[PDB]
Design goal:
Blueprint: H1 6-12, E1 31-35, H2 37-41, H3 46-55, H4 61-72, E2 78-82, E3 85-90, E4 93-98, E5 100-108, E6 114-121, E7 132-136, E8 148-153, H5 157-162, E9 169-172, H6 177-185
Antiparallel strand pairs: 1-2, 1-9, 2-3, 3-4, 5-6, 6-7, 7-8, 8-9
Helix pairs in contact: 3-4
Bound molecules: nickel (II) ion.
GO cellular component, one term: cytosol
Pfam families: ZinT
Subcellular location: Cytoplasm; Periplasm
Length: 187
Amino acid sequence: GKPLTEVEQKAANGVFDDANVQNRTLSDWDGVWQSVYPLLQSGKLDPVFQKKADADKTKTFAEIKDYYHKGYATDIEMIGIEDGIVEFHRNNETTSCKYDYDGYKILTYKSGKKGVRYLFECKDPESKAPKYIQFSDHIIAPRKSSHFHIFMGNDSQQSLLNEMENWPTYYPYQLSSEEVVEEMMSH
Ligand code: NI
């Protein structure tokens, strides 16, 4: 964690120019990562949603939680990334691929906020890993990720760009559940 520059902080809140977006390498996401979904399911994220619903007079607790329930849903409990390989862990079963970088795509949301998807492709015919994956983590140039959202599929990169409601979400495996909540409480 270098401190964020001025550009980097605005970019994290979805305000950036296209010309400042730069390519990134898979190693920005090296590490071992826990899905946050079990934390939602156990009620451990509720203080996140309590705070959010309190601050937002247009949304109820149930509106906030449901939106994140839909967003975080996945049975990939863990992801490991190392030496250009991403490993996916579902109930006792592991798949992995040496992913190739395919560039990024800039998306503009209805709010007018912006974000960048970083696209990779698995070209390994033996692999059972998703053929396409996209990383989104409020960062628009090389920098070690502190948490990320990942889109996974076997159909097309465009199909994943169209996705807006499910975005399995990963924080460092080493963080306690309390620390995830505190991170969520802020950023
Ligand atoms: Ni995020």
